[PDB]
């Protein structure tokens, strides 16, 4: 795939391109690989489409009833679920994710668990096959707490290269902006993210 | 690693005559399950009334029928234009697929046309050059639903005379240019049906003492 | 018995009333890499033959300079060089095609899917495709590698036999052939949405489009979808 | 495939079958499992279709060009022996064929030669080879005297050809016949196994396993 | 090697005006050796025929499996099993062993008993239902009997006349069959009569 | 393999067994009775993998002697052979399965007629006029074919039985040091001592 | 095989070919690969032919259970995730690729099912060895808000695109209109392109002709 | 490896890391993958040293010869000696090569000649291990006609990003410019290009 | 493979040679003197690989033959020996490699002395009193060790062979179908054709 998530000033944006292909075919070009586990608790999906997608929704049962007992449930704890799954299940899945969400006290919060089972806490993470071209520019055009707008075109440059580049990643580039207001999705279309 | 082969499917079927002999073949040429064309001939005119056709491999046929028309160019030129007796051209075409016999012509090979005595005959040959010369035979990945049905309707196989208990054998005619024809047109339509590499067009070479004829038949592009 | 690497992807084309039209995108890729941006895979020899080639990329460069070799000796010692013995489509054809037969036989082929398309002297319509195997074939409609799949059945819906050349006008086959190339960008994953195509009129003689783009893409409804069943957000 | 050839009183019989199959599929019964090499010799198709039409086909011609050269006629020992050399001087480049190379000469007698793809070349009076090769030997084995009438010994090759026929899959379709005399070999036709088989279960008496 | 094509056989079965026929051949062979002329592939079930092709251990088992599962189901249900049922019991049946399948290639024909329809139908090895109005085929010669089916049938064809159609389109196939022949035998069932013929073919 | 032979007569069943066990280099024994008693009427000879042999003739004997004295009734040989049949058809998708193949050969006290039954490893059974398991039946086959009558005399058949013994010591590149040859009739089962010799 | 399903305003509708193969035969030339869960939620079957029948009789009949306990219309959004969860328990073992469309009291659904059991949600979705072929008509013909008839014609154009253009599909069009106010239709064969032209011949054996050896007649009831 | 070559308004310039690895084990950290085959014909070094050392000792003589015969040698020509060793000898080699240089006509001209032997002309090129994260930086970063010093930070840039992603690459950055004026030879030392 | 054996004794050297063609299933003849005659008093007996036996031992037929024609002086044991090996020890590192053993034994008419030579495909040379190739040796080297003399009579030493030949019939699982027993001294090379039953 191709998936990246963003922290700043007012919470946290996840971004994703929409294609997944089986060989050179893309069996769909409109893939919405941001995926919901909780109302302000998002992922991103990268790997098998069929292990990324069972574990969303096994995750997004977990936490369904974690909040029927116990309350609202933490960015950190949808983390944990996910490592858990991944982790003590490495040897038969293909899976990588970043969740992100937003709370109140801490804000902006991104989680990155790559195909080991491992989980690191980061400003921004960046994953997916087409992500190995574009630590270049991100590592020098991310900046911390920017504005709901600067964090956007950061996103969208960041994956109009990884795109362009990447021959297992395009479509239509999806966000999803997680704030206190609410939840906001955006679309950006190829007729305007490849002009940059 | 590379891999110097292919199929292109196709099945050929030869038939000789009394005083003629025919020589068939589908239309279609495919890769694996996509169609390549529904129209590339697959049975050609070589002169001297000489027919034939080299399937299986594409390449490997194309390659070896443009050998022999070569073949035949200079047996005239070398023997003051004389004709090239079906016979020999068998033979050549067995030193010609045996040279390259480590590493042969991937390809079920069948010519017809008439012997040095005018009745029909047929040659089918090896991809190494093995050769014999037929009644009918068929070539290519159709050749199991078409031979059996050959068996019964032209060499009258396990068919009796009714009611003489099952002693005395269907006694064998021999059949029109019209007629055997009609079962050519009949094995295909019926193999089109269940063998998913035949269909499209069925294009038949006709050899008599006047020389060669051109007839073709639509089938089914499914 | 090499492997490919910088390769291109599909060349596709159809034969029409008068001449014929061959397209083919300009990107050469290194794997999963959309390397190269710039790379033209529409080969003109004269001014009635073009070559479309597909597959690597090195190996066609070579082939490209055969031609331009094959274009210098014609001219050699031939006064008709630029009329009655100059270079045809049915030539360079066999010429090609000999060389990649003669190339698989000795086990180092040329990594190649070719289309020659073009006009003969006498009005003619010339189409034919030759592999890296060196097997050949000729329908009213070829494409090569992946083309093949999804190109063909659209244009076979235009032509789909032979009785229906004459009936296809040129803006209708430049149509077709214009969206099988956006069908092509929508499905391949190592396509470019820059291609190139070329018309070869009996009547106008070769028309060459450089830096063309697939418009009109209908991307709407990506918005309507969320989700991958159970989703409603 | 079956093919087998004998000594005798009367000279060599040799008899084959003449099916022929890919895999599961029969995909022709008209072979000619007997190689009239020239007047005077035979070989027997055993192995592989074309390497031994072919290389025997060519040894007819080694074999004229010697009797043109010494104005007499080759002797099986010195015809097999070339045929043997060429085969080994192409040892496991993926040459099959298994074959009797049969002759009757002023000086040598009925003489028999079996020839194999290993460089292999030996003299003697009973072979039978291919897949149904087990089941002609136990004919050939039980009923075989040397002074056997050349009629009696014609059947006989008849016989242990069917008797593989019927049990191997692999071989049947029809038996061709030879005779081998100091003046040379005499075709004794061509016999339909469908129709031998029943022939035989009547006269015989035997085949009592198999209702008909 | 492959399991479904060592022993060997063939099975075929058509449909006529008010009637159905099933046939098969008698080989069982190791490989290249035949080994008995008197192994009927064909078994019946009250007014059911199943025929099964493959792997002998298998027809055997298979057969000896289905009378049990039958028998059971007439004394229980009170009545003997239809053949739209009994195929729908070969399926979930055959189904039952999805990752170690029985090496067969089942055929059920016969006339369901309450409307008088024929029926004819066949399995693969895990149990995909393939019904067909005209005929079915299996076996080692799956390609030969295709070949002469599509050739010889026409549908509707008068009983008597339906036994010379099917009978030809076996012979033909298995003489052009290695591993299949050395007799064969052909049920006709009428919707109350039911006739078997035993051939006359080579034996090679 | 290991030389397992049989063929039904008029009167009775007649089951020849190779004499020798081969242990890869040396012969170890010049003669093996490779066949168990399964009862009074009902002969089982058997070839085939190392262990797997005896252990599962054994086991069948057990179990049809179980069931003899259980309902004192002597189980027919087409029963003993269906059941060795399944026995060996369950083992065949087992863990680790039989490999052995069996002759079984009896009288049928009932029809007063004999029976000889061919099982292979797989579970394959049908029943025979002469039989023989491992390669032994290619060089046999033949002269049965030719020479076998149905009507054939308990003599008779010993004498047809030497000239297949015969063939398979002439064309047969094994040393199998003999057959012991044993017979099935009314009477029950006893043994011919006197063969490579008759 | 050749599979497709197509949203329009007030429904969805899906199609499939006829032509079931086994290697390079054609074993069915008309097994519907249409298959229902619900009435008014059915599939289309492409990959192992008994596993989307297996898989189907199964998840349909447990929907059917469940449509009883909870007195409510089934769901296709239930469908899908038992068939996707059931799918993904065995690793992909299970050679089911289908596309899941129908309607239910939440509106108008079409979703896909890949064997190792990722789901795809669209408004145009093809699957099978004609996938190809059917999705480049869908590519070029689809806009947003069809009409029953138009989303017919859509779907049977893209099924037709397979059966030529794919060695893999062929003979028949199936369809199914699942429309959200009306009852499902499933019109069976709703295309028939591929007759077979009357034979050349008629091969209807004289009485007699066939050599019989025994007869004998069985015995049917006890 | 990990080097780049680019063009500008004076002439072209070249850049690498100098770290030749085999393993885990830096074998050399100090690498002049900066080689000479004329005046003003300079390559980018990466694949195989043994390779791409014996193709440049070649091609040096090639021109040495050609300039004794024929005279200076256009860039192109560096090019084409150096595609028709690779491509005609594909099968045996591993190596990936930039042929840059500066004559009077065209100024600064880039070739970069890929694994297969294939040969394109650019504005800039990239190659060896480590290019694959800075696809993204350049194409965005990138600009024609350029100042000296604006390209020269344009490559340390670039070239910071992909030592710091890859393990293949590192040690110092060595440049190469060439002008009508002149060879200079640059280098870059960590404790500068990492602080960016 | 094939039985291959030889002793030398006092007064000449005997070989020992297996009678049996074997192609895979059939035994193909039962009679083969796998021995050529290299002279006057020098033998060879040889096996191994299919066709590759007989082509070296004609091989070197010929070109003993030839030196002896030449000098027309019979090329000593010794002799012959030292070039069989050499053309061996070429062959082993050539494109394809006589894959061929061989038992030399002939009389040295200068030393009045019989000798007998084992050589291995590889070229590996060395002088017995007796030898073998194949497996040949495992049953048999046990009795030679115990009952040989190197004064032993040219009968005492048949006897003693007979009892090798013995034991390999008895414990050794390939019907080789006998011997020919070739006997080389001061008269020649003569063979022996009453043995299994001497």
Same mark, same amino acid.
Not at chain 2, 126 to 138: F, H, I, L, W
Not at chain 3, 187 to 213: E, H, M, V, Y
Not at chain 5, 1 to 30: E, F, H
Not at chain 6, 133 to 153: A, E, K, N, Q
């Given at each position: 795939?191709?998936?990246?998530?963003?922290?700043?000033?007012?919470?946290?944006?996840?971004?994703?391109?929409?294609?997944?292909?089986?060989?050179?075919?893309?069996?769909?070009?409109?893939?919405?690989?941001?995926?919901?586990?909780?109302?302000?608790?998002?992922?991103?999906?990268?790997?098998?489409?069929?292990?990324?997608?069972?574990?969303?929704?096994?995750?997004?049962?977990?936490?369904?009833?974690?909040?029927?007992?116990?309350?609202?449930?933490?960015?950190?704890?949808?983390?944990?679920?996910?490592?858990?799954?991944?982790?003590?299940?490495?040897?038969?899945?293909?899976?990588?994710?970043?969740?992100?969400?937003?709370?109140?006290?801490?804000?902006?919060?991104?989680?990155?668990?790559?195909?080991?089972?491992?989980?690191?806490?980061?400003?921004?993470?960046?994953?997916?096959?087409?992500?190995?071209?574009?630590?270049?520019?991100?590592?020098?055009?991310?900046?911390?707490?920017?504005?709901?707008?600067?964090?956007?075109?950061?996103?969208?440059?960041?994956?109009?290269?990884?795109?362009?580049?990447?021959?297992?990643?395009?479509?239509?580039?999806?966000?999803?902006?997680?704030?206190?207001?609410?939840?906001?999705?955006?679309?950006?279309?190829?007729?305007?993210?490849?002009?940059? | 690693?590379?891999?110097?082969?292919?199929?292109?499917?196709?099945?050929?079927?030869?038939?000789?005559?009394?005083?003629?002999?025919?020589?068939?073949?589908?239309?279609?040429?495919?890769?694996?399950?996509?169609?390549?064309?529904?129209?590339?001939?697959?049975?050609?005119?070589?002169?001297?009334?000489?027919?034939?056709?080299?399937?299986?491999?594409?390449?490997?046929?194309?390659?070896?029928?443009?050998?022999?028309?070569?073949?035949?160019?200079?047996?005239?030129?070398?023997?003051?234009?004389?004709?090239?007796?079906?016979?020999?051209?068998?033979?050549?075409?067995?030193?010609?697929?045996?040279?390259?016999?480590?590493?042969?012509?991937?390809?079920?090979?069948?010519?017809?046309?008439?012997?040095?005595?005018?009745?029909?005959?047929?040659?089918?040959?090896?991809?190494?050059?093995?050769?014999?010369?037929?009644?009918?035979?068929?070539?290519?990945?159709?050749?199991?639903?078409?031979?059996?049905?050959?068996?019964?309707?032209?060499?009258?196989?396990?068919?009796?005379?009714?009611?003489?208990?099952?002693?005395?054998?269907?006694?064998?005619?021999?059949?029109?240019?019209?007629?055997?024809?009609?079962?050519?047109?009949?094995?295909?339509?019926?193999?089109?049906?269940?063998?998913?590499?035949?269909?499209?067009?069925?294009?038949?070479?006709?050899?008599?003492?006047?020389?060669?004829?051109?007839?073709?038949?639509?089938?089914?592009?499914? | 018995?090499?492997?490919?690497?910088?390769?291109?992807?599909?060349?596709?084309?159809?034969?029409?009333d008068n001449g014929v039209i061959i397209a083919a995108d300009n990107?050469?890729?290194?794997?999963?890499?959309?390397?190269?941006?710039?790379?033209?895979?529409?080969?003109?020899?004269?001014?009635?033959?073009?070559?479309?080639?597909?597959?690597?990329?090195?190996?066609?460069?070579?082939?490209?300079?055969?031609?331009?070799?094959?274009?210098?000796?014609?001219?050699?010692?031939?006064?008709?060089?630029?009329?009655?013995?100059?270079?045809?489509?049915?030539?360079?054809?066999?010429?090609?095609?000999?060389?990649?037969?003669?190339?698989?036989?000795?086990?180092?082929?040329?990594?190649?899917?070719?289309?020659?398309?073009?006009?003969?002297?006498?009005?003619?319509?010339?189409?034919?495709?030759?592999?890296?195997?060196?097997?050949?074939?000729?329908?009213?409609?070829?494409?090569?590698?992946?083309?093949?799949?999804?190109?063909?059945?659209?244009?076979?819906?235009?032509?789909?036999?032979?009785?229906?050349?004459?009936?296809?006008?040129?803006?209708?086959?430049?149509?077709?052939?214009?969206?099988?190339?956006?069908?092509?960008?929508?499905?391949?994953?190592?396509?470019?949405?820059?291609?190139?195509?070329?018309?070869?009129?009996?009547?106008?003689?070769?028309?060459?489009?450089?830096?063309?783009?697939?418009?009109?893409?209908?991307?709407?409804?990506?918005?309507?979808?969320?989700?991958?069943?159970?989703?409603?957000? | 495939?079956?093919?087998?050839?004998?000594?005798?009183?009367?000279?060599?019989?040799?008899?084959?079958?003449?099916?022929?199959?890919?895999?599961?599929?029969?995909?022709?019964?008209?072979?000619?499992?007997?190689?009239?090499?020239?007047?005077?010799?035979?070989?027997?198709?055993?192995?592989?279709?074309?390497?031994?039409?072919?290389?025997?086909?060519?040894?007819?011609?080694?074999?004229?060009?010697?009797?043109?050269?010494?104005?007499?006629?080759?002797?099986?020992?010195?015809?097999?022996?070339?045929?043997?050399?060429?085969?080994?001087?192409?040892?496991?480049?993926?040459?099959?064929?298994?074959?009797?190379?049969?002759? *009757?000469?002023?000086? $040598?007698?009925?003489? /028999? @030669?079996?020839?194999?793809? %290993?460089?292999?070349? #030996?003299?003697?009076?009973?072979?039978?080879?291919?897949?149904?090769?087990?089941?002609?030997?136990?004919?050939?084995?039980?009923?075989?005297?040397?002074?056997?009438?050349?009629?009696?010994?014609?059947?006989?090759?008849?016989?242990?050809?069917?008797?593989?026929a019927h049990r191997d899959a692999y071989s049947g379709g029809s038996?061709?016949? *030879?005779?081998?005399? $100091?003046?040379?070999? /005499? @075709?004794?036709?061509?016999? %339909?196994?469908?129709? #031998?088989?029943?022939?035989?279960?009547?006269?015989?008496?035997?085949?009592?396993?198999?209702?008909? | 090697?492959?399991?479904?094509?060592?022993?060997?056989?063939?099975?075929?079965?058509?449909?006529?005006?008010?009637?159905?026929?099933?046939?098969?051949?008698?080989?069982?062979?190791?490989?290249?050796?035949?080994?008995?002329?008197?192994?009927?592939?064909?078994?019946?079930?009250?007014?059911?025929?199943?025929?099964?092709?493959?792997?002998?251990?298998?027809?055997?088992?298979?057969?000896?499996?289905?009378?049990?599962?039958?028998?059971?189901?007439?004394?229980?249900?009170?009545?003997?099993?239809?053949?739209?049922?009994?195929?729908?019991?070969?399926?979930?049946?055959?189904?039952?062993?999805?990752?170690?399948?029985?090496?067969?290639?089942?055929?059920?024909?016969?006339?369901?008993?309450?409307?008088?329809?024929?029926?004819?139908?066949?399995?693969?090895?895990?149990?995909?239902?393939?019904?067909?109005?005209?005929?079915?085929?299996?076996?080692?010669?799956?390609?030969?009997?295709?070949?002469?089916?599509?050739?010889?049938?026409?549908?509707?064809?008068?009983?008597?006349?339906?036994?010379?159609?099917?009978?030809?389109?076996?012979?033909?196939?298995?003489?052009?069959?290695?591993?299949?022949?050395?007799?064969?035998?052909?049920?006709?069932?009428?919707?109350?009569?039911?006739?078997?013929?035993?051939?006359?073919?080579?034996?090679? | 393999?290991?030389?397992?032979?049989?063929?039904?007569?008029?009167?009775?069943?007649?089951?020849?067994?190779?004499?020798?066990?081969?242990?890869?280099?040396?012969?170890?024994?010049?003669?093996?009775?490779?066949?168990?008693?399964?009862?009074?009427?009902?002969?089982?000879?058997?070839?085939?993998?190392?262990?797997?042999?005896?252990?599962?003739?054994?086991?069948?004997?057990?179990?049809?002697?179980?069931?003899?004295?259980?309902?004192?009734?002597?189980?027919?040989?087409?029963?003993?052979?269906?059941?060795?049949?399944?026995?060996?058809?369950?083992?065949?998708?087992?863990?680790?399965?039989?490999?052995?193949?069996?002759?079984?050969?009896?009288?049928?006290?009932?029809?007063?007629?004999?029976?000889?039954?061919?099982?292979?490893?797989?579970?394959?059974?049908?029943?025979?006029?002469?039989?023989?398991?491992?390669?032994?039946?290619?060089?046999?086959?033949?002269?049965?074919?030719?020479?076998?009558?149905?009507?054939?005399?308990?003599?008779?058949?010993?004498?047809?039985?030497?000239?297949?013994?015969?063939?398979?010591?002439?064309?047969?590149?094994?040393?199998?040091?003999?057959?012991?040859?044993?017979?099935?009739?009314?009477?029950?089962?006893?043994?011919?001592?006197?063969?490579?010799?008759? | 095989?050749?599979?497709?399903?197509?949203?329009?305003?007030?429904?969805?509708?899906?199609?499939?070919?006829?032509?079931?193969?086994?290697?390079?035969?054609?074993?069915?030339?008309?097994?519907?690969?249409?298959?229902?869960?619900?009435?008014?939620?059915?599939?289309?079957?492409?990959?192992?032919?008994?596993?989307?029948?297996?898989?189907?009789?199964?998840?349909?009949?447990?929907?059917?259970?469940?449509?009883?306990?909870?007195?409510?219309?089934?769901?296709?959004?239930?469908?899908?995730?038992?068939?996707?969860?059931?799918?993904?328990?065995?690793?992909?073992?299970?050679?089911?690729?289908?596309?899941?469309?129908?309607?239910?009291?939440?509106?108008?659904?079409?979703?896909?099912?890949?064997?190792?059991?990722?789901?795809?949600?669209?408004?145009?979705?093809?699957?099978?060895?004609?996938?190809?072929?059917?999705?480049?008509?869908?590519?070029?013909?689809?806009?947003?808000?069809?009409?029953?008839?138009?989303?017919?014609?859509?779907?049977?154009?893209?099924?037709?695109?397979?059966?030529?253009?794919?060695?893999?599909?062929?003979?028949?069009?199936?369809?199914?209109?699942?429309?959200?106010?009306?009852?499902?239709?499933?019109?069976?064969?709703?295309?028939?392109?591929?007759?077979?032209?009357?034979?050349?011949?008629?091969?209807?054996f004289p009485r007699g002709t066939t050599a019989v050896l025994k007869?004998?007649?069985?015995?049917?009831?006890?």
């Amino acid at each position: 795939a191709s998936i990246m998530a963003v922290t700043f000033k007012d919470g946290v944006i996840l971004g994703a391109d929409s294609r997944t292909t089986t060989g050179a075919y893309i069996a769909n070009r409109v893939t919405d690989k941001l995926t919901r586990v909780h109302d302000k608790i998002w992922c991103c999906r990268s790997g098998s489409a069929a292990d990324t997608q069972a574990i969303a929704d096994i995750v997004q049962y977990h936490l369904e009833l974690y909040t029927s007992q116990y309350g609202t449930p933490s960015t950190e704890t949808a983390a944990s679920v996910f490592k858990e799954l991944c982790y003590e299940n490495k040897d038969n899945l293909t899976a990588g994710i970043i969740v992100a969400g937003y709370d109140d006290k801490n804000k902006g919060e991104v989680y990155t668990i790559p195909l080991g089972g491992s989980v690191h806490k980061l400003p921004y993470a960046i994953a997916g096959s087409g992500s190995t071209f574009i630590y270049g520019y991100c590592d020098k055009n991310f900046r911390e707490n920017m504005s709901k707008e600067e964090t956007v075109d950061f996103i969208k440059h960041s994956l109009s290269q990884a795109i362009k580049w990447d021959g297992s990643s395009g479509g239509v580039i999806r966000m999803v902006v997680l704030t206190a207001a609410g939840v906001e999705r955006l679309i950006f279309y190829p007729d305007e993210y490849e002009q940059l | 690693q590379f891999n110097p082969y292919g199929d292109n499917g196709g099945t050929i079927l030869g038939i000789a005559g009394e005083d003629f002999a025919v020589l068939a073949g589908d239309t279609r040429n495919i890769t694996d399950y996509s169609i390549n064309s529904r129209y590339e001939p697959k049975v050609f005119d070589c002169g001297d009334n000489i027919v034939m056709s080299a399937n299986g491999f594409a390449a490997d046929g194309d390659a070896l029928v443009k050998r022999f028309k070569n073949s035949v160019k200079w047996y005239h030129f070398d023997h003051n234009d004389k004709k090239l007796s079906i016979n020999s051209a068998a033979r050549n075409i067995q030193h010609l697929l045996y040279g390259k016999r480590f590493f042969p012509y991937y390809v079920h090979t069948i010519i017809a046309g008439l012997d040095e005595d005018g009745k029909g005959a047929v040659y089918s040959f090896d991809p190494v050059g093995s050769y014999e010369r037929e009644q009918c035979r068929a070539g290519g990945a159709a050749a199991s639903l078409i031979m059996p049905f050959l068996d019964n309707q032209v060499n009258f196989k396990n068919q009796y005379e009714p009611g003489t208990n099952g002693k005395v054998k269907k006694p064998l005619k021999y059949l029109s240019v019209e007629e055997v024809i009609k079962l050519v047109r009949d094995s295909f339509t019926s193999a089109t049906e269940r063998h998913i590499q035949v269909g499209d067009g069925l294009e038949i070479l006709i050899v008599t003492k006047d020389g060669v004829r051109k007839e073709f038949y639509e089938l089914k592009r499914d | 018995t090499q492997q490919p690497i910088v390769t291109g992807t599909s060349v596709i084309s159809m034969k029409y009333d008068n001449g014929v039209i061959i397209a083919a995108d300009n990107l050469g890729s290194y794997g999963s890499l959309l390397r190269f941006n710039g790379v033209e895979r529409l080969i003109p020899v004269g001014d009635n033959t073009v070559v479309g080639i597909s597959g690597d990329i090195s190996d066609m460069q070579h082939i490209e300079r055969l031609l331009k070799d094959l274009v210098t000796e014609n001219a050699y010692d031939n006064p008709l060089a630029d009329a009655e013995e100059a270079l045809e489509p049915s030539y360079i054809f066999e010429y090609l095609a000999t060389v990649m037969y003669q190339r698989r036989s000795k086990m180092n082929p040329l990594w190649n899917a070719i289309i020659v398309a073009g006009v003969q002297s006498n009005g003619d319509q010339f189409l034919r495709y030759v592999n890296l195997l060196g097997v050949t074939y000729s329908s009213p409609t070829l494409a090569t590698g992946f083309g093949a799949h999804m190109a063909n059945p659209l244009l076979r819906k235009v032509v789909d036999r032979e009785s229906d050349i004459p009936k296809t006008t040129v803006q209708v086959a430049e149509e077709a052939i214009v969206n099988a190339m956006r069908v092509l960008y929508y499905r391949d994953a190592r396509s470019s949405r820059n291609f190139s195509l070329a018309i070869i009129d009996k009547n106008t003689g070769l028309t060459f489009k450089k830096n063309l783009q697939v418009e009109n893409m209908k991307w709407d409804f990506a918005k309507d979808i969320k989700g991958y069943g159970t989703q409603k957000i | 495939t079956t093919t087998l050839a004998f000594r005798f009183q009367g000279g060599i019989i040799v008899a084959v079958d003449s099916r022929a199959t890919a895999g599961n599929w029969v995909a022709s019964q008209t072979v000619k499992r007997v190689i009239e090499i020239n007047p005077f010799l035979l070989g027997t198709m055993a192995g592989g279709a074309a390497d031994c039409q072919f290389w025997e086909t060519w040894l007819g011609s080694q074999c004229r060009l010697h009797e043109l050269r010494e104005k007499e006629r080759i002797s099986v020992a010195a015809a097999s022996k070339i045929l043997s050399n060429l085969v080994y001087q192409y040892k496991g480049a993926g040459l099959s064929m298994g074959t009797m190379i049969c002759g *009757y000469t002023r000086k $040598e007698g009925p003489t /028999i @030669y079996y020839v194999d793809s %290993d460089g292999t070349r #030996l003299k003697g009076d009973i072979f039978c080879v291919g897949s149904g090769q087990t089941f002609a030997y136990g004919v050939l084995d039980s009923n075989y005297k040397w002074d056997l009438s050349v009629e009696d010994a014609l059947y006989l090759g008849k016989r242990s050809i069917l008797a593989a026929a019927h049990r191997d899959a692999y071989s049947g379709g029809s038996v061709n016949l *030879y005779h081998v005399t $100091e003046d040379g070999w /005499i @075709y004794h036709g061509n016999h %339909d196994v469908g129709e #031998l088989f029943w022939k035989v279960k009547e006269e015989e008496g035997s085949f009592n396993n198999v209702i008909g | 090697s492959d399991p479904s094509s060592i022993n060997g056989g063939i099975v075929v079965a058509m449909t006529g005006k008010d009637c159905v026929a099933i046939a098969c051949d008698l080989r069982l062979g190791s490989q290249s050796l035949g080994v008995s002329n008197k192994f009927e592939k064909i078994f019946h079930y009250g007014h059911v025929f199943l025929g099964i092709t493959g792997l002998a251990t298998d027809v055997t088992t298979l057969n000896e499996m289905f009378r049990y599962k039958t028998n059971l189901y007439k004394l229980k249900e009170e009545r003997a099993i239809e053949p739209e049922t009994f195929t729908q019991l070969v399926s979930s049946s055959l189904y039952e062993r999805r990752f170690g399948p029985y090496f067969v290639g089942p055929v059920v024909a016969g006339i369901n008993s309450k409307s008088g329809k024929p029926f004819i139908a066949g399995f693969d090895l895990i149990g995909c239902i393939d019904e067909a109005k005209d005929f079915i085929v299996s076996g080692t010669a799956s390609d030969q009997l295709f070949g002469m089916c599509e050739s010889l049938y026409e549908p509707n064809l008068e009983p008597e006349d339906l036994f010379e159609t099917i009978s030809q389109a076996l012979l033909n196939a298995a003489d052009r069959d290695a591993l299949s022949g050395w007799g064969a035998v052909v049920y006709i069932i009428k919707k109350d009569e039911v006739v078997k013929r035993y051939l006359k073919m080579r034996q090679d | 393999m290991d030389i397992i032979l049989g063929i039904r007569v008029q009167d009775s069943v007649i089951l020849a067994s190779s004499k020798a066990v081969t242990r890869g280099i040396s012969v170890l024994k010049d003669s093996d009775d490779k066949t168990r008693q399964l009862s009074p009427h009902t002969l089982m000879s058997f070839a085939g993998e190392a262990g797997d042999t005896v252990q599962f003739a054994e086991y069948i004997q057990a179990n049809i002697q179980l069931y003899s004295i259980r309902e004192d009734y002597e189980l027919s040989p087409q029963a003993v052979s269906s059941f060795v049949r399944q026995e060996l058809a369950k083992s065949i998708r087992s863990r680790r399965p039989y490999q052995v193949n069996v002759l079984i050969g009896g009288y049928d006290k009932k029809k007063n007629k004999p029976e000889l039954y061919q099982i292979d490893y797989l579970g394959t059974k049908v029943e025979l006029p002469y039989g023989a398991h491992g390669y032994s039946g290619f060089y046999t086959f033949s002269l049965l074919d030719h020479h076998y009558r149905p009507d054939m005399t308990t003599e008779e058949g010993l004498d047809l039985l030497k000239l297949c013994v015969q063939e398979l010591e002439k064309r047969m590149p094994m040393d199998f040091k003999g057959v012991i040859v044993k017979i099935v009739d009314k009477d029950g089962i006893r043994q011919v001592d006197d063969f490579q010799a008759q | 095989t050749t599979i497709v399903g197509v949203k329009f305003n007030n429904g969805v509708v899906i199609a499939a070919d006829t032509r079931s193969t086994q290697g390079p035969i054609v074993a069915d030339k008309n097994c519907a690969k249409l298959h229902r869960i619900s009435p008014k939620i059915w599939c289309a079957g492409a990959g192992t032919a008994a596993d989307t029948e297996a898989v189907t009789q199964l998840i349909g009949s447990n929907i059917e259970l469940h449509s009883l306990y909870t007195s409510r219309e089934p769901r296709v959004v239930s469908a899908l995730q038992m068939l996707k969860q059931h799918l993904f328990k065995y690793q992909g073992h299970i050679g089911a690729y289908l596309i899941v469309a129908g309607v239910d009291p939440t509106g108008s659904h079409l979703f896909s099912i890949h064997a190792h059991g990722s789901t795809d949600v669209g408004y145009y979705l093809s699957l099978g060895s004609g996938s190809l072929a059917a999705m480049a008509v869908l590519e070029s013909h689809w806009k947003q808000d069809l009409t029953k008839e138009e989303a017919i014609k859509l779907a049977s154009d893209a099924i037709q695109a397979g059966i030529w253009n794919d060695l893999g599909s062929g003979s028949n069009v199936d369809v199914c209109v699942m429309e959200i106010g009306k009852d499902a239709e499933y019109l069976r064969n709703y295309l028939t392109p591929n007759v077979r032209e009357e034979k050349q011949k008629s091969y209807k054996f004289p009485r007699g002709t066939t050599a019989v050896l025994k007869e004998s007649i069985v015995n049917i009831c006890d």
